[PDB]
Amino acid sequence: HHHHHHAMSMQDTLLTLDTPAAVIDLDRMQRNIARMQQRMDAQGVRLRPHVKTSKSVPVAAAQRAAGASGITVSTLKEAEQFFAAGTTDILYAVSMAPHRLPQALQLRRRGCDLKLIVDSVAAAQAIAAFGREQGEAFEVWIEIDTDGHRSGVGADDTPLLLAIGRTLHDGGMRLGGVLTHAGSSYELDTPEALQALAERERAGCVQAAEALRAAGLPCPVVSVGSTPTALAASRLDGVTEVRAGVYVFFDLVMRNIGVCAAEDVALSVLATVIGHQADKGWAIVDAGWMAMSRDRGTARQKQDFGYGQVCDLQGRVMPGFVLTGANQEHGILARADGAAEADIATRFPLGTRLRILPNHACATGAQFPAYQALAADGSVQTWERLHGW
Amino acid sequence: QDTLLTLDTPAAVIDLDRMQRNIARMQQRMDAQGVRLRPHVKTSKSVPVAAAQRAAGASGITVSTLKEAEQFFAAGTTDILYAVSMAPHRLPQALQLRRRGCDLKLIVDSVAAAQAIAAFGREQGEAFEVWIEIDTDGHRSGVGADDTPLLLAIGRTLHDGGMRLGGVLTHAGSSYELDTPEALQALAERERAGCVQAAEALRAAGLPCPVVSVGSTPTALAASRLDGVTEVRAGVYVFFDLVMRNIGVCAAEDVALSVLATVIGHQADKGWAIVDAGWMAMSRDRGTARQKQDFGYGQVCDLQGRVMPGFVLTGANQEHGILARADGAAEADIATRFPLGTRLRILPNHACATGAQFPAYQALAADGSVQTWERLHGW
Numbered sequence: 131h132h133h134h135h136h137a138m139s140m141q142d143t144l145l146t147l148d149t150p151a152a153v154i155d156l157d158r159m160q161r162n163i164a165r166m167q168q169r170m171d172a173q174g175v176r177l178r179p180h181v182k183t184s185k186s187v188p189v190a191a192a193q194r195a196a197g198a199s200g201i202t203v204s205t206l207k208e209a210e211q212f213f214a215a216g217t218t219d220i221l222y223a224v225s226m227a228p229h230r231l232p233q234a235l236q237l238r239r240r241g242c243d244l245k246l247i248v249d250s251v252a253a254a255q256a257i258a259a260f261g262r263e264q265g266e267a268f269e270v271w272i273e274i275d276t277d278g279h280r281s282g283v284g285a286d287d288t289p290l291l292l293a294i295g296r297t298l299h300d301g302g303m304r305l306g307g308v309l310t311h312a313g314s315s316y317e318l319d320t321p322e323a324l325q326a327l328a329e330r331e332r333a334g335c336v337q338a339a340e341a342l343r344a345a346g347l348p349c350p351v352v353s354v355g356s357t358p359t360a361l362a363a364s365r366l367d368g369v370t371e372v373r374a375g376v377y378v379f380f381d382l383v384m385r386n387i388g389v390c391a392a393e394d395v396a397l398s399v400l401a402t403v404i405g406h407q408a409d410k411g412w413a414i415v416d417a418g419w420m421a422m423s424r425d426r427g428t429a430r431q432k433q434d435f436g437y438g439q440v441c442d443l444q445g446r447v448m449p450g451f452v453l454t455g456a457n458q459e460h461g462i463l464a465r466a467d468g469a470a471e472a473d474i475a476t477r478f479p480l481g482t483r484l485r486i487l488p489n490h491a492c493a494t495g496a497q498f499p500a501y502q503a504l505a506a507d508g509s510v511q512t513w514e515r516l517h518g519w
Numbered sequence: 520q521d522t523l524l525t526l527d528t529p530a531a532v533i534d535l536d537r538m539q540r541n542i543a544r545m546q547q548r549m550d551a552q553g554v555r556l557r558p559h560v561k562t563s564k565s566v567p568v569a570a571a572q573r574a575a576g577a578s579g580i581t582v583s584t585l586k587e588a589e590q591f592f593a594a595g596t597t598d599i600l601y602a603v604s605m606a607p608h609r610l611p612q613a614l615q616l617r618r619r620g621c622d623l624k625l626i627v628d629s630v631a632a633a634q635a636i637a638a639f640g641r642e643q644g645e646a647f648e649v650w651i652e653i654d655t656d657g658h659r660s661g662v663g664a665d666d667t668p669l670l671l672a673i674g675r676t677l678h679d680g681g682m683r684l685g686g687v688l689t690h691a692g693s694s695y696e697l698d699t700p701e702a703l704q705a706l707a708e709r710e711r712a713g714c715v716q717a718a719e720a721l722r723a724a725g726l727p728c729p730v731v732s733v734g735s736t737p738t739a740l741a742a743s744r745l746d747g748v749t750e751v752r753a754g755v756y757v758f759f760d761l762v763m764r765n766i767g768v769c770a771a772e773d774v775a776l777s778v779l780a781t782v783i784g785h786q787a788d789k790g791w792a793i794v795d796a797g798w799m800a801m802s803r804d805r806g807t808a809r810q811k812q813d814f815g816y817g818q819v820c821d822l823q824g825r826v827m828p829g830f831v832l833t834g835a836n837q838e839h840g841i842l843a844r845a846d847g848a849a850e851a852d853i854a855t856r857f858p859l860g861t862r863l864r865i866l867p868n869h870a871c872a873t874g875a876q877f878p879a880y881q882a883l884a885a886d887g888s889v890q891t892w893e894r895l896h897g898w
């Protein structure tokens with residue numbers, strides 16, 4: 131039992147970690163994983179989780195174990211990490227830059243079934259010319275703009291859809307599908323508006339696929355998604371897969387959109403109280419914006435949580451206390467309502483540990499080299515995640 | 520050689536000639552004021568950047584985390600001030616650094632934190648050097664500049680408890696809400712006077728107070744005189760940023776840190792160029808939104824570093840930035856001006872926030888080559 135005794139001596143808990151730390155409540159993370167996978171199984175579509183929220187091998191392993199099919203990545207560094215870890219079905223869902231083609235070629239030549247996306251004739255021409263030069267039939271999907279959010283060919287822009295699809299297909303590449311991301315779902319906050327946007331996202335992606343196929347071009351995959359529209363879609367006829375990422379943890383922006391409650395948020399930042407300004411009702415904590423990130427997505431929503439909702443050590447919300455301000459390594463904990471708490475030092479004594487729910491899980495997670503994955507027994511384990519490009 | 524044409528994007532680029540000018544300007548101002556400069560490395564967390572600050576005449580550093588103290592001590596820097604109210608649970612970490620030879624200084628602003636340090640120091644045989652943080656402007660931590668009984672209670676806990684009461688410090692961070700030389704000069708004087716007043720109160724009580732330490736970059740550059748001050752702490756000046764430009768202490772052309780980005784697409788009807796520098800590259804900091812000129816997620820510059828006024832990142836998602844006209848109009852033929860693959864450089868709202876998004880900087884020399892300069896992430 132030499133290993134056992136030594137490992138027990140080294141095991142951390144929420145009391146022994148240094149702060150700040152990004153804590154994943156594994157039981158909440160597994161409920162979120164199951165909820166999404168079950169919804170997609172009920173819809174008869176594949177779930178291709180977007181790992182840009184955690185960039186962590188063990189978190190994606192849990193998603194794969196639950197039934198996910200492949201992943202979506204936001205950078206080729208994520209494709210390199212997850213392919214090294216055994217994931218071969220990877221979609222790089224950012225408009226392809228020609229200068230990154232040698233790295234995408236190398237990944238495919240090592241055995242990664244890496245898919246790229248474009249939304250322009252010039253990007254299609256760059257991929258097809260390099261593929262012909264290098265003897266590589268890249269798989270390329272066409273990105274569709276279904277809601278005005280960001281990149282993509284308009285769903286009704288048949289001439290440009292065909293021009294890009296022909297450039298790829300005639301060029302000897304594999305035109306593998308269409309995808310869309312209805313990111314404007316983050317501006318909504320009612321179930322009726324989310325359900326309608328989910329239907330516009332489905333209808334527009336399938337419209338683009340049907341236009342390509344009406345021109346004789348292959349388009350076997352139809353991929354949609356954002357977490358809110360994944361959870362709100364009534365029907366997904368014509369869709370092969372849904373992509374969703376932030377759901378794995380949720381956050382307060384998702385709580386305000388209405389697709390989860392604060393009790394579903396699996397990621398919190400463990401912080402210590404390091405001081406006060408008693409006459410202003412401030413407790414000062416060691417989670418500033420370097421821990422929380424500068425994300426303030428809740429500022430324009432129905433309930434502004436400042437730099438995060440305060441919870442006790444046990445992870446239960448402490449209503450009315452939020453981080454009202456943040457500097458790099460100092461957070462200002464005070465009443466959301468703008469009163470000065472009396473006796474703030476008795477409410478929050480020096481050295482008290484608290485947990486802060488984030489505005490945006492993807493933004494807060496990226497501030498940490500690793501998560502501390504919290505098991506039901508109170509034990510944590512360090513789960514590394516990727517930083518940079 | 521690696522150059523701005525060969526790097527992958529996004530990348531954090533330091534223009535070394537601009538950084539050296541910013542380093543010289545600050546050190547020459549501190550020398551003119553008769554005070555030491557103790558740079559705050561939380562902006563770069565990079566050994567070669569702090570080396571350049573030391574070569575120019577800096578005396579010790581300030582750090583925002585013990586991880587920084589570990590990094591810089593492993594690189595040979597021993598005169599380290601950890602300028603965040605000390606948490607008692609980090610005392611074992613601080614003790615081990617001191618026992619290894621790091622001359623690590625801690626700060627406190629409460630009797631309870633001072634008692635925890637003094638009790639642990641006596642148990643472990645360690646006379647911790649502790650400074651008392653003074654609140655001169657209501658920004659953040661510190662003993663109020665008027666609150667003499669609290670100041671003396673802490674000073675006596677430390678000195679009677681066997682610890683080394685090494686000084687007082689203040690950080691007038693409310694300087695970042697100002698934007699005129701008269702208001703910055705007045706706040707710099709309030710910061711100076713408040714910190715010197717606390718030192719005098721300690722000394723009048725028979726307590727040691729050899730160091731009087733003030734600073735933020737705007738008050739460091741605006742102070743007219745620094746009588747009674749021994750050192751100034753400043754950090755973001757090494758690179759500057761657009762929040763600094765709006766406060767009025769630099770020009771956009773002085774900003775030494777930019778994010779190299781590639782154009783990866785367009786929305787021509789809206790006049791957008793989409794770049795691969797989203798908020799993961801720039802950070803979510805939007806400090807210019809509250810100032811007199813809003814630069815969105817950053818100011819566009821060409822690959823040579825020429826500022827392109829009127830183009831900014833008007834929006835950002837994680838790995839996509841939206842480049843568009845600041846005047847709200849849809850640039851006609853945006854794709855013809857910025858073809859796919861064009862490289863641009865984006866000046867940040869907040870240098871300390873943008874830098875923390877990158878594992879390393881790319882230090883750009885006069886000949887156009889780059890050298891990778893690692894920086895620290897995490898705690």
Ligand SMILES: *Cc1c(COP(=O)(O)O)cnc(C)c1O
Pocket residue numbers: 180182183202223310311355356357358373374375376377
């Ligand atoms: C982020 C992202 C997703 C996942 O959206 P969430 O709302 O985080 O689930 C899907 N597709 C693309 C292209 C994305 O960038």
Ligand SMILES: *Cc1c(COP(=O)(O)O)cnc(C)c1O
Pocket residue numbers: 559561562581602689690734735736737752753754755756
């Ligand atoms: C950040 C910081 C500084 C340096 O301020 P800048 O405006 O970045 O130069 C000085 N002192 C303390 C305590 C700080 O936190």
Ligand SMILES: [Cl-]
Pocket residue numbers: 457458459
């Ligand atoms: Cl700060």
Ligand SMILES: [Cl-]
Pocket residue numbers: 836837838
């Ligand atoms: Cl995003």
Ligand SMILES: [Mg+2]
Pocket residue numbers: 376490492493
């Ligand atoms: Mg997100």
Ligand SMILES: [Mg+2]
Pocket residue numbers: 519527
């Ligand atoms: Mg690389």
Ligand SMILES: [Mg+2]
Pocket residue numbers: 407409654662663
């Ligand atoms: Mg006060």
Ligand SMILES: [Mg+2]
Pocket residue numbers: 755869870871872
């Ligand atoms: Mg700063």
Ligand SMILES: [Mg+2]
Pocket residue numbers: 148585586898
């Ligand atoms: Mg540490």
